[PDB]
Design an enzyme around this catalytic site. Structure first.
Site, short mmCIF file in Angstrom:
data_model
loop_
_atom_site.label_atom_id
_atom_site.label_comp_id
_atom_site.label_asym_id
_atom_site.label_seq_id
_atom_site.Cartn_x
_atom_site.Cartn_y
_atom_site.Cartn_z
N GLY A 1 0.83 -1.19 0.00
CA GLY A 1 0.00 0.00 0.00
C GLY A 1 0.86 1.24 0.00
O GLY A 1 1.93 1.26 0.61
N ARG B 1 -1.08 9.02 0.69
CA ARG B 1 -0.64 10.23 1.39
C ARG B 1 -0.18 9.91 2.81
O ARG B 1 0.60 10.68 3.39
CB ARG B 1 -1.78 11.26 1.42
N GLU C 1 3.39 4.38 3.52
CA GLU C 1 3.43 3.07 2.89
C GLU C 1 3.00 1.99 3.88
O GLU C 1 3.19 2.13 5.08
CB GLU C 1 4.84 2.71 2.40
CG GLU C 1 5.41 3.63 1.37
CD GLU C 1 6.91 3.46 1.15
OE1 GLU C 1 7.56 2.60 1.82
OE2 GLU C 1 7.44 4.18 0.30
N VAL C 2 2.43 0.91 3.37
CA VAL C 2 2.24 -0.29 4.17
C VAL C 2 2.99 -1.44 3.51
O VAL C 2 2.95 -1.59 2.29
CB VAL C 2 0.75 -0.66 4.36
CG1 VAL C 2 0.65 -1.99 5.12
CG2 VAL C 2 0.03 0.42 5.12
N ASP D 1 -12.44 8.68 11.73
CA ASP D 1 -12.24 8.50 10.29
C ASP D 1 -12.66 7.11 9.86
O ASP D 1 -11.95 6.42 9.12
CB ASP D 1 -10.80 8.76 9.89
CG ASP D 1 -10.64 8.96 8.38
OD1 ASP D 1 -9.49 8.91 7.91
OD2 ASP D 1 -11.65 9.21 7.70
C1 LIG Z 1 0.16 -1.46 10.01
O1 LIG Z 1 -0.82 -0.45 10.02
C2 LIG Z 1 -1.81 -0.55 9.06
C3 LIG Z 1 -1.86 -1.54 8.10
C4 LIG Z 1 -2.92 -1.57 7.20
C5 LIG Z 1 -2.91 -2.62 6.14
N1 LIG Z 1 -2.59 -3.90 6.35
C6 LIG Z 1 -2.62 -4.50 5.14
C7 LIG Z 1 -2.39 -5.87 4.79
C8 LIG Z 1 -2.50 -6.21 3.46
C9 LIG Z 1 -2.82 -5.25 2.51
C10 LIG Z 1 -2.92 -5.70 1.06
O2 LIG Z 1 -3.45 -5.03 0.24
N2 LIG Z 1 -2.32 -6.97 0.75
C11 LIG Z 1 -2.36 -7.49 -0.60
C12 LIG Z 1 -3.76 -8.02 -0.88
C13 LIG Z 1 -4.52 -7.08 -1.82
N3 LIG Z 1 -5.95 -7.28 -1.68
C14 LIG Z 1 -6.62 -6.01 -1.84
C15 LIG Z 1 -6.38 -8.21 -2.71
C16 LIG Z 1 -3.06 -3.93 2.85
C17 LIG Z 1 -2.94 -3.59 4.21
N4 LIG Z 1 -3.15 -2.40 4.83
C18 LIG Z 1 -3.46 -1.16 4.14
C19 LIG Z 1 -4.77 -1.30 3.36
C20 LIG Z 1 -4.18 -0.33 2.32
C21 LIG Z 1 -2.80 -0.59 2.88
C22 LIG Z 1 -3.89 -0.58 7.23
C23 LIG Z 1 -3.82 0.40 8.18
O3 LIG Z 1 -4.78 1.42 8.29
C24 LIG Z 1 -5.86 1.34 7.40
C25 LIG Z 1 -2.80 0.41 9.09
O4 LIG Z 1 -2.72 1.42 10.04
C26 LIG Z 1 -3.08 1.09 11.35
#
Ligand SMILES: COc1cc(-c2nc3ccc(C(=O)NCCCN(C)C)cc3n2C2CCC2)cc(OC)c1OC
Length: 307
Positions: free
Chosen positions: A23, A26, A29-30, A144
């Site tokens: 990910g 703004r 990155e994740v 949010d």
């Molecule tokens: C560590 O902190 C955080 C992590 C995450 C988070 N874990 C994730 C684990 C996996 C993925 C992700 O796409 N795998 C690939 C699979 C794609 N499929 C959409 C098909 C995406 C993740 N994401 C965010 C969602 C957009 C990026 C999200 C957070 O807040 C919304 C956050 O903040 C507390």
């Protein structure tokens, strides 16, 4: 607090290897990282959002926040990678990613739709409820809530993520951390009273009701993707037809405050008992009068009765 002991938190961050970038936005990155061969999610905050990193770090470290429907905190660190100092938040890794992305990839049936929305309601009630005692927690309003801030588990439950804008209330402390301007979240999901800035910024229950407004919008997003009789709607964000991408405050005020518009209910939902019930539920989250909106616990109860 919610994660590892702070001594372990520091050693963990150093022991993580970053494997894949899943990910970017703004916010920064994740990444999918690995700690001793186990997946973890690592959010690397942009400078623009550094204060959210700090606020979320202090929240999770000082409040016992462990709940099946809240993203599981592991550690936070200001660490170095590739000779750059970075702000990391380390959590449980949910391979499915965000509810926002998940709803664009597949459709739902009655069981999986209800599982999603009940797990969100359960997580939201747990955030909102103040628990007294030595192992309790302050009341927490998210500020949010939206589908990009909900993650999907392999079992079809979800968890609420991103507490960087959350406000907290204890019987003890009197001054909320409203933080000046109430318009801190995502404009498309903001309640009328935030948009027109009449929200009582000093009243903590006002922030719970803003969350409920946003939850109703998420309910609508999800219910569109539940199939009935081979019919489904495409994924769309709330109000996608009546406002542009990156809508302005004024765009949103005219729709939600002046015209008192709400997302349209697809006709076919009234051919299905579950979607009929959900339509009624989301309308009870969207009342113009914030005090008329259902509580998270009342929503949870209703969803439990639908099955
Ligand atoms: C560590 O902190 C955080 C992590 C995450 C988070 N874990 C994730 C684990 C996996 C993925 C992700 O796409 N795998 C690939 C699979 C794609 N499929 C959409 C098909 C995406 C993740 N994401 C965010 C969602 C957009 C990026 C999200 C957070 O807040 C919304 C956050 O903040 C507390």
């Amino acid at each position: 607090g919610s994660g590892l002991p702070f001594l372990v938190q520091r050693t963990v961050a150093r022991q993580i290897t970053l494997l894949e970038c899943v990910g970017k936005g703004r916010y920064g990155e994740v990444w999918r990282g690995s700690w001793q061969g186990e997946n973890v999610a690592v959010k690397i905050f942009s400078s623009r959002d550094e204060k959210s990193w700090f606020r979320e770090t202090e929240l999770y470290n000082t409040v016992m926040l462990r709940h099946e429907n809240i993203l599981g905190f592991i550690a936070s660190d200001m660490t170095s990678r590739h000779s750059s100092t970075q702000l990391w938040l380390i959590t449980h890794y949910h391979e499915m990613g965000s509810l926002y992305d998940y709803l664009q990839l597949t459709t739902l049936d009655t069981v999986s739709c209800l599982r999603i929305v009940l797990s969100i309601a359960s997580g939201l009630a747990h955030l909102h409820i103040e628990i007294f005692g030595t192992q309790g927690k302050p009341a927490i309003a998210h500020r949010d809530l939206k589908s990009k801030n909900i993650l999907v588990k392999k079992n079809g439950q979800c968890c609420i993520a991103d507490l960087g804008l959350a406000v907290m209330h204890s019987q003890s402390t009197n001054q909320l951390d409203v933080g000046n301007n109430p318009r801190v979240g995502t404009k498309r999901y903001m309640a009328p009273e935030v948009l027109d800035e009449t929200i009582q910024v000093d009243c903590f229950d006002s922030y719970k009701r803003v969350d409920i407004w946003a939850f109703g919008l998420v309910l609508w997003e999800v219910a569109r993707r539940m199939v009935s009789n081979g019919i489904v709607e495409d994924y769309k964000p709330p109000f996608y037809d009546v406002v542009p991408n990156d809508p302005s405050f004024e765009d949103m005020r005219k729709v939600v405050c002046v015209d008192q518009q709400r997302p349209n209910i697809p006709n076919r939902w009234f051919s299905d008992p579950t979607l009929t019930s959900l339509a009624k539920l989301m309308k009870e989250c969207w009342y113009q009068n914030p005090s008329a909106r259902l509580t998270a616990l009342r929503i949870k109860k209703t969803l439990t009765k639908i099955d």
